[PDB]
Design an enzyme around this catalytic site. Structure first.
Site, PDB file in Angstrom:
ATOM      1  N   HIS F 200       0.871  -1.305   0.014  1.00 57.21           N
ATOM      2  CA  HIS F 200      -0.050   0.148  -0.091  1.00 57.21           C
ATOM      3  C   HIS F 200       0.836   1.280  -0.125  1.00 57.21           C
ATOM      4  O   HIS F 200       0.275   2.380  -0.265  1.00 57.21           O
ATOM      5  CB  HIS F 200      -1.044  -0.056   1.318  1.00 57.21           C
ATOM      6  CG  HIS F 200      -2.037  -0.919   1.081  1.00 57.21           C
ATOM      7  ND1 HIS F 200      -2.827  -1.432   2.303  1.00 57.21           N
ATOM      8  CD2 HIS F 200      -2.509  -1.668  -0.059  1.00 57.21           C
ATOM      9  CE1 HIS F 200      -3.841  -2.199   1.772  1.00 57.21           C
ATOM     10  NE2 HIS F 200      -3.622  -2.287   0.586  1.00 57.21           N
ATOM     11  N   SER F 204      -1.747  -0.057  -5.776  1.00 57.71           N
ATOM     12  CA  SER F 204      -1.994  -0.926  -6.892  1.00 57.71           C
ATOM     13  C   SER F 204      -1.658  -0.513  -8.275  1.00 57.71           C
ATOM     14  O   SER F 204      -1.837   0.437  -8.789  1.00 57.71           O
ATOM     15  CB  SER F 204      -3.445  -1.388  -6.857  1.00 57.71           C
ATOM     16  OG  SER F 204      -4.026  -2.550  -7.719  1.00 57.71           O
ATOM     17  N   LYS F 226     -17.742  -4.254  -6.253  1.00 54.18           N
ATOM     18  CA  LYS F 226     -17.105  -4.984  -7.140  1.00 54.18           C
ATOM     19  C   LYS F 226     -16.701  -6.272  -6.757  1.00 54.18           C
ATOM     20  O   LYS F 226     -16.932  -7.566  -7.234  1.00 54.18           O
ATOM     21  CB  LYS F 226     -16.212  -4.247  -8.075  1.00 54.18           C
ATOM     22  CG  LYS F 226     -15.361  -4.867  -9.253  1.00 54.18           C
ATOM     23  CD  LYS F 226     -14.418  -3.969  -9.768  1.00 54.18           C
ATOM     24  CE  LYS F 226     -13.736  -4.706 -10.999  1.00 54.18           C
ATOM     25  NZ  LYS F 226     -14.658  -4.759 -12.175  1.00 54.18           N
ATOM     26  N   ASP F 227     -16.092  -6.245  -5.620  1.00 49.54           N
ATOM     27  CA  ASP F 227     -15.439  -7.370  -4.865  1.00 49.54           C
ATOM     28  C   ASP F 227     -16.651  -8.111  -4.172  1.00 49.54           C
ATOM     29  O   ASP F 227     -16.587  -9.370  -3.980  1.00 49.54           O
ATOM     30  CB  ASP F 227     -14.484  -7.074  -3.727  1.00 49.54           C
ATOM     31  CG  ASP F 227     -13.221  -6.656  -4.399  1.00 49.54           C
ATOM     32  OD1 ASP F 227     -12.953  -6.960  -5.457  1.00 49.54           O
ATOM     33  OD2 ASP F 227     -12.434  -6.211  -3.908  1.00 49.54           O
ATOM     34  N   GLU F 270      -2.931 -34.812  -5.772  1.00 45.24           N
ATOM     35  CA  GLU F 270      -4.071 -34.056  -6.071  1.00 45.24           C
ATOM     36  C   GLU F 270      -3.678 -32.874  -7.070  1.00 45.24           C
ATOM     37  O   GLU F 270      -2.398 -32.555  -6.926  1.00 45.24           O
ATOM     38  CB  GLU F 270      -4.773 -33.334  -4.940  1.00 45.24           C
ATOM     39  CG  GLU F 270      -3.834 -32.510  -4.042  1.00 45.24           C
ATOM     40  CD  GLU F 270      -2.747 -33.146  -3.160  1.00 45.24           C
ATOM     41  OE1 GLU F 270      -2.948 -34.494  -3.275  1.00 45.24           O
ATOM     42  OE2 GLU F 270      -2.032 -32.565  -2.360  1.00 45.24           O
TER      43      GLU F 270
HETATM   44  C1  HEM Z   1      -3.857 -15.948   0.054  1.00 43.95           C
HETATM   45  C2  HEM Z   1      -3.126 -15.578  -0.822  1.00 43.95           C
HETATM   46  C3  HEM Z   1      -2.907 -14.051  -1.066  1.00 43.95           C
HETATM   47  C4  HEM Z   1      -3.659 -12.893  -0.369  1.00 43.95           C
HETATM   48  C5  HEM Z   1      -4.792 -13.059   0.639  1.00 43.95           C
HETATM   49  C6  HEM Z   1      -3.241 -11.874  -0.965  1.00 43.95           C
HETATM   50  C7  HEM Z   1      -3.779 -10.552  -1.013  1.00 43.95           C
HETATM   51  C8  HEM Z   1      -3.599  -9.467  -1.822  1.00 43.95           C
HETATM   52  C9  HEM Z   1      -4.651  -8.349  -1.753  1.00 43.95           C
HETATM   53  C10 HEM Z   1      -5.902  -8.120  -1.047  1.00 43.95           C
HETATM   54  C11 HEM Z   1      -3.760  -7.596  -2.868  1.00 43.95           C
HETATM   55  C12 HEM Z   1      -4.726  -6.107  -3.210  1.00 43.95           C
HETATM   56  C13 HEM Z   1      -4.767  -5.907  -4.732  1.00 43.95           C
HETATM   57  C14 HEM Z   1      -5.699  -7.028  -5.513  1.00 43.95           C
HETATM   58  O1  HEM Z   1      -6.453  -7.674  -4.594  1.00 43.95           O
HETATM   59  O2  HEM Z   1      -5.484  -7.373  -6.540  1.00 43.95           O
HETATM   60  C15 HEM Z   1      -2.988  -8.191  -3.322  1.00 43.95           C
HETATM   61  C16 HEM Z   1      -2.022  -7.646  -4.460  1.00 43.95           C
HETATM   62  C17 HEM Z   1      -0.803  -8.273  -4.975  1.00 43.95           C
HETATM   63  N1  HEM Z   1      -0.475  -9.528  -4.710  1.00 43.95           N
HETATM   64 FE1  HEM Z   1      -1.430 -10.636  -3.254  1.00 43.95          FE
HETATM   65  N2  HEM Z   1      -2.236 -12.006  -1.944  1.00 43.95           N
HETATM   66  C18 HEM Z   1      -1.994 -13.463  -2.109  1.00 43.95           C
HETATM   67  C19 HEM Z   1      -1.179 -14.157  -2.696  1.00 43.95           C
HETATM   68  C20 HEM Z   1      -0.094 -13.458  -3.597  1.00 43.95           C
HETATM   69  C21 HEM Z   1       1.018 -14.277  -4.334  1.00 43.95           C
HETATM   70  C22 HEM Z   1       1.122 -15.717  -4.400  1.00 43.95           C
HETATM   71  C23 HEM Z   1       1.772 -13.461  -5.073  1.00 43.95           C
HETATM   72  C24 HEM Z   1       2.623 -13.701  -6.057  1.00 43.95           C
HETATM   73  C25 HEM Z   1       3.238 -14.756  -6.401  1.00 43.95           C
HETATM   74  C26 HEM Z   1       0.998 -12.283  -4.662  1.00 43.95           C
HETATM   75  C27 HEM Z   1       1.354 -11.107  -5.392  1.00 43.95           C
HETATM   76  C28 HEM Z   1       0.723  -9.876  -5.199  1.00 43.95           C
HETATM   77  C29 HEM Z   1       1.269  -8.596  -6.030  1.00 43.95           C
HETATM   78  C30 HEM Z   1       2.334  -8.369  -6.668  1.00 43.95           C
HETATM   79  C31 HEM Z   1       0.108  -7.290  -5.730  1.00 43.95           C
HETATM   80  C32 HEM Z   1       0.092  -6.248  -6.263  1.00 43.95           C
HETATM   81  C33 HEM Z   1      -1.245  -5.803  -7.054  1.00 43.95           C
HETATM   82  C34 HEM Z   1      -0.766  -4.576  -7.988  1.00 43.95           C
HETATM   83  O3  HEM Z   1       0.413  -4.039  -8.110  1.00 43.95           O
HETATM   84  O4  HEM Z   1      -1.644  -3.980  -8.517  1.00 43.95           O
HETATM   85  N3  HEM Z   1      -0.132 -12.299  -3.868  1.00 43.95           N
HETATM   86  N4  HEM Z   1      -2.615  -9.230  -2.682  1.00 43.95           N
END
Ligand code: HEM
Ligand SMILES: CCCCCCCCCCCCCCCCCC(=O)OC[C@H](COP(=O)([O-])OCC(O)COP(=O)([O-])OC[C@@H](COC(=O)CCCCCCCCCCCCCCCCC)OC(=O)CCCCCCCCCCCCCCCCC)OC(=O)CCCCCCCCCCCCCCCCC
Ligand SMILES: CCCCCCCCCCCCCCCCCC(=O)OC[C@H](COP(=O)([O-])OCC(O)COP(=O)([O-])OC[C@@H](COC(=O)CCCCCCCCCCCCCCCCC)OC(=O)CCCCCCCCCCCCCCCCC)OC(=O)CCCCCCCCCCCCCCCCC
Ligand SMILES: CCCCCCCCCCCCCCCCCC(=O)OC[C@H](COP(=O)([O-])OCC(O)COP(=O)([O-])OC[C@@H](COC(=O)CCCCCCCCCCCCCCCCC)OC(=O)CCCCCCCCCCCCCCCCC)OC(=O)CCCCCCCCCCCCCCCCC
Ligand SMILES: CCCCCCCCCCCCCCCCC[C@@H](O)O[C@H](CO[C@H](O)CCCCCCCCCCCCCCC)COP(=O)(O)OCC[N+](C)(C)C
Ligand SMILES: CCCCCCCC/C=C\CCCCCCCC(=O)OC[C@H](COP(=O)(O)OCCN)OC(=O)CCCCCCC/C=C\CCCCCCCC
Ligand SMILES: CCCCCCCC/C=C\CCCCCCCC(=O)OC[C@H](COP(=O)(O)OCCN)OC(=O)CCCCCCC/C=C\CCCCCCCC
Ligand code: HEM
Lengths: 81, 51, 446, 106, 62, 378
Positions: F200, F204, F226-227, F270
């Site tokens: 943050h 994003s 939207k979500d 799986e």
């Molecule tokens: C339970 C698993 C995860 C949760 C709850 C989570 C949570 C979130 C949330 C709430 C956002 C806000 C923006 C959006 O929703 O698009 C976000 C963004 C992001 N996430 Fe995750 N994430 C998870 C797993 C991952 C994984 C596995 C990766 C990469 C391998 C990742 C990489 C990113 C990145 C790079 C952003 C930035 C979005 C942007 O730049 O617009 N996240 N994540």
């Protein structure tokens, strides 16, 4: 320090709007919506689909090849004797 | 990546070499003690409460 | 044409005559009409007890307000008639008087010194005037910074040491000084061989010698009752003073570590290190990320408003260190940069930076000596401690010897893991508690 | 160093230029470039009217992206139409960084 | 004017934190063995004739 | 003077949710990220009510689940929501990572790395949890996966027995796996908090790849609904997978008791692990297959270093887009190959698919990125 007042400087870009209640939820769907979705899909095609078609080809060929070797194996015993 | 090599960077890495071997000794001996590694500990003159 | 090796040699050697009373005459020939003549007495603020702390400074104010030979107003009338600019000062370690006039006027000045040092009437009305004058001067200089903060720095660094008290002396004391205490101070201090006559400029040496014998030959070299006031060794302390007062626009921090005495080689290398840390002011257009790395830190997210790296030195003991003005909110950050710079020289000292520091140091030592007054003060102050004059060619020979390993070695010897002395005149609150600073004096990575 | 084959290069560059979708959104080439700190300082040095044109075209692009629409065909950016405004500045900035680095390695 | 042992000890081991951590680790290396065998010797000493390892004599080594 | 700005809890909610700027032009793909945030809750809550009947002993782990699916009221819906829920969790996960790989979101390197670690955490969680039911595939999968640890050259078997708690997989291993499976997801949650924390301070990313500071908009009015719609469609697809075809994403044989003695035929893990498993099938060497396996997931960390294009999103760079969908098709190839017995046709296609999987993103992508650079005259 990235609150809306803290963001980027910008100058005379006037913008117009309407209240949601003043306008219907689904304007010009039949006339403007569907053709838009169509141009979108038409842009997406060649960049996406054909490689998946290649997946279908390798899939069917692999299944036919395994099934071929497996059931022609006794047939391989047949040409053997 | 190419920029990192240079006339002063050689000097700097050379300045930190003794520190590098010393912490390497720290990690090595620390690992040997934390693990009770038997192989080197058989060789140490006094630390032989192991049977 | 232009070259170092010859140009160092064209600078004249300084003759050093010795009078029978032990007074040290000295001179440096030149081809200009103007010449300055002065007596750099070895006596300083370091010698006074608490009983008579203000004596030297107070006498520095009335050294020439009057005298037994002629009325003082007539004396100043005479010096003003000559066009001469007599001037004086009194450091913690070195009292000094000097004149500023044509070589044609040279003899007339010399005997005047032989008055001002040897005999000066001390009328009680004059002293009584100087009392309230100094008492209001005490109200004057307090408004100024810098000097106040260094005074806290000395009071911090030395405490019980005689060196610790200020040259001006306590305000309670200065109103209490008597004429008898002043004659006591005069009789027990100002005399040869502590005295050193010097006259760089257009002064021909032999004339200076004859004029020295004639008037300055009369100074006694024998203490009464054999009560010789021998100099004493000075302890250093790691303490701190933290005056606050939040209404001020800026905090004005000064930090210092123990340094080598005036007569040791190490100081030279230390000077180079000070060239690396670099003095700076934000008034300059040379700031931003440019110039000194401490200045590059001073102006990037905008830290230090103005600062300087200093290496004050006395006999036996000294003070390496730094001094910076600061905004209330940044007082910690500027520290984090500063100590880091020290640490950087305590370990990773690249050769090129050392080279730049040597060039800056050479340029400094040469640029200082232009003019007659600086070289007279040079001959005086050099004769009072080193002896000799330690010639500039020897300086570059000793600077060229410096190497990055020597720099890191000596800086590790004096800066690394040592206990800092701190003087902070406020506003202050974000300035780190002394344990944070002391722990800020060493890395856990090295 | 090819001649007519270089005109062929102009052709394939034109086709690839039309393959990229930013023409559909009215963007100049330089709007699309990723904004790392060098590009940031490069944008900081832009003349005010040009910077304004850039910010507005960026808003028009984001706004078209909002409703998933497309700029009308008459209004699309043309391959010969573009002015490569940001290049001299970005080259100055990058050259300054390379200068500071080459000084810094010595 | 005789030098204190700490004056040289600090000049060698303690002057750099890496050597400091190193001498600490070696110190742990010796202290573990010495202190462990010591505490074992003491606890073995308070209760002689009780611990079975001393009772093994009735049946050990054939 | 709104109260949100005053109370610190209302301050943090005012940051993370109600007021933080987002690009306006964010699409349906970013929604998947939030969906993951939702899935975890389900996987906790639902799972929390399975732990109230499950007995982690080897002699009773199966019968206890029979107790859940039969004796417990409404237990079967919890069972199937849980099991299918993990599958939806990894689907949203793969789509999320693909989104991050496509739009150049990997440039936020710290957030990327926290995402990778959180990925490994979710993988271990799903593994030990799949080991819990104590069927045929569960027991056998555990034996096969655990042995891989044995691969490590010197420590090997001592470490493997240290996981087993014994010579062989048995009740203590099951109890241990129940504990770690119980504990890991909350750590995944704290990591997720770190994840959003790093995320943050920059904001994003948007599909165009251009900075969106000119068109930032509050999160609450728009993206909450939207979500809400995306979460509703998620619950829709999940409930359709559970109430109509509970089994098809699963594998029969788990309903049989584990036999240390007898060995099941197809022995397929799986589906979300399958592609990785193919790599084990691909390299004849043991330790080599293990390193290729660890590289299969670590490799994501090297992507930012390998980036060469002067742009983020692939959408303006069609060639790299085509490589991207080649990569997706290749993942489908491995994912399908993992379901198949070794035979002439499969072994050759598996090796070629793996080598292509490594070469396309360690070689071809940067080079065609450079080509895309030269084509656009900078
Ligand atoms: C339970 C698993 C995860 C949760 C709850 C989570 C949570 C979130 C949330 C709430 C956002 C806000 C923006 C959006 O929703 O698009 C976000 C963004 C992001 N996430 Fe995750 N994430 C998870 C797993 C991952 C994984 C596995 C990766 C990469 C391998 C990742 C990489 C990113 C990145 C790079 C952003 C930035 C979005 C942007 O730049 O617009 N996240 N994540
Ligand atoms: C990390 C390295 C993996 C450790 C596995 C090696 C286990 C050591 C061993 O069995 O020694 C055998 C052998 C002789 O020991 P032994 O007479 O069989 O004594 C039995 C245990 O020491 C009796 O066990 P113990 O009570 O003395 O405790 C030893 C062991 C646990 O005690 C055991 O019961 C052995 C197996 C448990 C550890 C294995 C998984 C650890 C995770 O505890 C640890 O290894 C602490 C791990 C800390 C590693 C650094 C943390 C980084 C993260 O010593 C060796 O050859 C080396 C031992 C360490 C392995 C090599 C380390 C360098 C790589
Ligand atoms: C084998 C190990 C090899 C180590 C090689 C180190 C190479 C350089 C590096 O990685 O960072 C330098 C890093 C900082 O050391 P430094 O040179 O003294 O600090 C220079 C900076 O200006 C530090 O900035 P500062 O002035 O703000 O420091 C304030 C204070 C940090 O304040 C603290 O000490 C935190 C502890 C209080 C929290 C307790 C909360 C209670 C509720 O000092 C520390 O940094 C202590 C280091 C531990 C926290 C650092 C963050 C790491 C995550 O060095 C290390 O921490 C590693 C060496 C320490 C022992 C190694 C063995 C550990 C196992
Ligand atoms: C695993 C399966 C997961 C499937 C995706 C689930 C979530 C999709 C999503 O992001 O929310 C809906 C999302 C709403 O549109 P959006 O928010 O503007 O998304 C950004 C566009 O991708 C921005 O790109 P665009 O504006 O150029 O339009 C992309 C899309 C254009 O699709 C749309 O305009 C939105 C959906 C309208 C078509 C609905 C057809 C009947 C249902 O073109 C395609 O349909 C892909 C070409 C290959 C499939 C052709 C037939 C599928 C329909 O629609 C899609 O992302 C496309 C769904 C593709 C269906 C799967 C086709 C199999 C491959
Ligand atoms: C359930 C609760 C768990 C916690 C239990 C708490 C137990 C109580 C004891 C914990 C605190 C005791 C305090 C110990 C002294 C404070 C440590 C500190 O003072 O050390 C400083 C520095 O810290 C350490 O000394 C640095 C060396 C670190 C050595 C590491 C050895 C190997 C540790 C490996 C552990 C890695 C984790 C592995 C886990 C699997 C030294 O400061 P200082 O003296 O002023 O400056 C250094 C002077 N020099 C120049 C001489 C060096
Ligand atoms: C490869 C490189 C690997 C290097 C990694 C090094 C990390 C090893 C230990 C890190 C733990 C940090 C806690 C240390 C606490 C501490 O700072 O003590 C003071 C000391 C020096 O501090 P300064 O003098 O201020 O440094 C100024 C230097 N200019 O720093 C130290 O490292 C000594 C540590 C002793 C203090 C012990 C207390 C540390 C905090 C413990 C709380 C941890 C709770 C976490 C529980 C979670 C359980 C799931
Ligand atoms: C493991 C996989 C096992 C799953 C089994 C079967 C899964 C089949 C997956 C195939 C789904 C692909 C259909 C996507 C349709 C599509 O992308 O349409 C084209 C459309 C056009 O986009 P624009 O460039 O914006 O167009 C500009 C116009 N304004 O392209 C996209 O938007 C797609 C970009 C989002 C990527 C999502 C793809 C989902 C799969 C990605 C996973 C691959 C990464 C794997 C890494 C995992 C490591 C742990
Ligand atoms: C991201 C988080 C989680 C994921 C992806 C996940 C996934 C899974 C999977 C794949 C299974 C195998 C079930 C089957 O195939 O039949 C399972 C079972 C199980 N899960 Fe989770 N899980 C998660 C978190 C949790 C949590 C927080 C709990 C808390 C109690 C939990 C408790 C259980 C229990 C007790 C079982 C075995 C009981 C049974 O299968 O009947 N899980 N989980």
């Amino acid at each position: 320090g990235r609150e809306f007042g803290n963001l980027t400087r910008m100058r005379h870009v006037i913008s117009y709007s309407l209240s949601p209640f003043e306008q219907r939820a689904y304007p010009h769907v039949f006339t403007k919506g569907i053709p838009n979705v169509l141009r979108r899909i038409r842009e997406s095609f060649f960049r996406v689909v054909p490689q998946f078609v290649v997946f279908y080809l390798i899939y069917t060929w692999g299944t036919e090849e395994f099934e071929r070797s497996k059931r022609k194996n006794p047939a391989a015993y047949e040409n053997d004797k | 990546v190419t920029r990192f090599l240079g006339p002063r960077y050689r000097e700097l890495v050379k300045n930190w070499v003794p520190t590098a071997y010393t912490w390497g000794a720290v990690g090595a001996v620390g690992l040997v003690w934390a693990t009770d590694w038997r192989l080197i500990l058989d060789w140490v003159p006094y630390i032989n409460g192991k049977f | 044409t232009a070259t170092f090796a010859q140009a160092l040699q064209f600078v004249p050697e300084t003759q050093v005559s010795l009078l029978d009373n032990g007074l040290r005459v000295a001179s440096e020939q030149s081809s200009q009409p103007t010449c300055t003549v002065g007596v750099w007495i070895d006596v300083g603020s370091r010698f006074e007890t608490e009983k008579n702390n203000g004596a030297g400074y107070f006498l520095e104010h009335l050294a020439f307000k009057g005298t037994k030979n002629r009325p003082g107003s007539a004396l100043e009338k005479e010096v003003e008639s000559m066009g001469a600019h007599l001037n004086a000062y009194s450091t913690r370690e070195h009292t000094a008087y000097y004149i500023k006039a044509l070589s044609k006027d040279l003899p007339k000045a010399v005997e005047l010194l032989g008055d001002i040092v040897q005999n000066c009437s001390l009328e009680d009305s004059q002293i009584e005037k100087e009392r309230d004058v100094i008492l209001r001067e005490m109200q004057e200089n307090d408004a100024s910074m810098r000097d106040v903060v260094f005074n806290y720095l000395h009071a911090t660094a030395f405490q019980g040491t005689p060196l610790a008290q200020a040259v001006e002396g306590p305000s309670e004391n200065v109103r209490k000084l008597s004429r008898a205490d002043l004659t006591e101070y005069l009789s027990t201090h100002y005399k040869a061989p502590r005295m050193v006559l010097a006259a760089a400029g257009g002064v021909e040496h032999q004339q200076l010698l004859d004029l020295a014998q004639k008037h300055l030959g009369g100074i006694p070299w024998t203490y009464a009752e054999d009560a010789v006031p021998t100099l004493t060794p000075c302890r250093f302390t790691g303490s701190e003073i933290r005056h606050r007062d939040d209404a001020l626009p800026f905090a004005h921090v000064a930090i210092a570590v123990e340094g080598p005495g005036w007569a040791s080689p190490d100081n030279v290398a230390l000077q180079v290190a000070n060239a690396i840390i670099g003095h700076y002011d934000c008034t300059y257009g040379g700031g931003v990320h440019l110039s000194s790395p401490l200045a590059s830190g001073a102006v990037a997210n905008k830290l230090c408003q103005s600062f300087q790296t200093f290496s004050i030195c006395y006999a036996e003991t000294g003070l390496l260190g730094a001094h910076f003005v600061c905004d209330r909110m940044k007082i910690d950050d500027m520290m984090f940069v500063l100590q880091g710079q020290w640490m950087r020289l305590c370990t990773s000292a690249t050769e090129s930076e050392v080279a730049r520091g040597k060039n800056i140091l050479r340029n400094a030592l040469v640029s200082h000596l232009d003019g007659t007054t600086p070289v007279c003060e040079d001959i005086g102050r050099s004769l009072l401690t080193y002896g000799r004059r330690i010639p500039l060619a020897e300086w570059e020979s000793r600077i060229a010897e410096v190497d990055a390993s020597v720099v890191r070695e000596i800086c590790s010897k004096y800066i690394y893991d040592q206990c800092p002395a701190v003087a902070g005149y406020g506003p202050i609150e974000q300035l780190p508690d002394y344990n944070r600073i002391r722990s800020g004096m060493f890395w856990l990575r090295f | 160093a090819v001649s007519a084959s270089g005109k062929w290069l102009d052709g394939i560059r034109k086709w690839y230029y039309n393959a990229a979708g930013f023409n559909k959104l009215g963007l100049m080439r330089d709007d699309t470039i990723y904004e790392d700190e060098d590009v940031k300082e490069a944008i900081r040095r832009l003349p005010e009217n040009l910077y304004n044109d850039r910010m507005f075209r960026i808003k028009r692009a984001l706004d078209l992206n909002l409703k998933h629409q497309i700029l009308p065909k008459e209004q699309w950016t043309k391959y010969e139409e573009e002015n490569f405004y940001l290049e001299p500045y970005l080259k100055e900035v990058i050259r300054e960084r390379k200068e500071r680095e080459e000084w810094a390695k010595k | 004017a005789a030098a204190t042992l700490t004056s040289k000890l600090y000049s060698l081991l303690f002057r750099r934190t890496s050597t400091f951590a190193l001498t600490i680790i070696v110190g742990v290396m010796f202290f573990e063995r010495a202190f462990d065998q010591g505490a074992d010797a003491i606890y073995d000493h308070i209760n002689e004739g009780k611990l079975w390892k001393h009772i093994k004599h009735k049946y050990e080594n054939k | 003077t709104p109260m949100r700005k005053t109370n610190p809890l209302m301050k943090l909610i005012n940051h993370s949710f109600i007021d933080l700027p987002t690009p306006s032009n964010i699409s349906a793909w970013w929604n998947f990220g939030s969906l993951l945030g939702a899935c975890l809750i389900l996987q906790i809550t639902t799972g929390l009510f399975l732990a109230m009947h499950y007995s982690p002993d080897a002699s009773t782990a199966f019968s206890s689940i029979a107790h859940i699916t039969r004796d417990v009221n409404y237990g079967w819906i919890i069972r199937y929501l849980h099991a299918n829920g993990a599958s939806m969790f990894f689907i949203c996960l793969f789509l999320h990572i693909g989104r991050g790989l496509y739009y150049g979101s990997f440039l936020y390197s710290e957030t990327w790395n926290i995402g990778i670690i959180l990925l490994l955490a979710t993988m271990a969680t799903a593994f030990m949890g799949y080991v819990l039911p104590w069927g045929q595939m569960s027991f056998w999968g555990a034996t096969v996966i655990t042995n891989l640890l044995s691969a490590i050259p010197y420590i090997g078997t001592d470490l493997v027995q240290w996981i087993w708690g014994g010579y062989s997989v048995d009740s203590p291993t099951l109890t241990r796996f129940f504990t770690f499976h119980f504990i890991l997801p909350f750590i995944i949650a704290a990591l997720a908090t770190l994840h959003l924390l790093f995320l943050h301070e920059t904001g994003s990313n948007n599909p165009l790849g251009i900075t969106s500071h000119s068109d930032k908009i509050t999160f609450h009015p728009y993206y909450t609904i939207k979500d809400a719609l995306g979460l509703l469609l998620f619950l829709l697809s999940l409930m359709t997978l559970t109430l109509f075809s509970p089994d098809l994403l699963g594998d029969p044989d788990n309903y049989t008791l584990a036999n240390p003695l007898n060995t099941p035929p197809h022995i397929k893990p799986e589906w979300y692990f399958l592609f990785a498993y193919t790599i084990l099938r691909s390299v004849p060497n043991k330790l080599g297959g293990v390193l290729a396996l660890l590289l299969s997931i670590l490799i994501l960390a090297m992507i930012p270093i390998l980036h060469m294009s002067k742009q983020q999103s692939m959408m303006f760079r069609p060639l790299s887009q085509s490589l991207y969908w080649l990569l997706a098709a290749d993942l489908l190839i491995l994912t399908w190959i993992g379901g198949q017995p070794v035979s002439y046709p499969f072994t050759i296609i598996g090796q070629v698919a793996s080598v292509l999987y490594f070469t396309t993103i360690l070689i071809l992508m940067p080079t065609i990125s450079l080509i895309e650079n030269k084509m656009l005259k900078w």
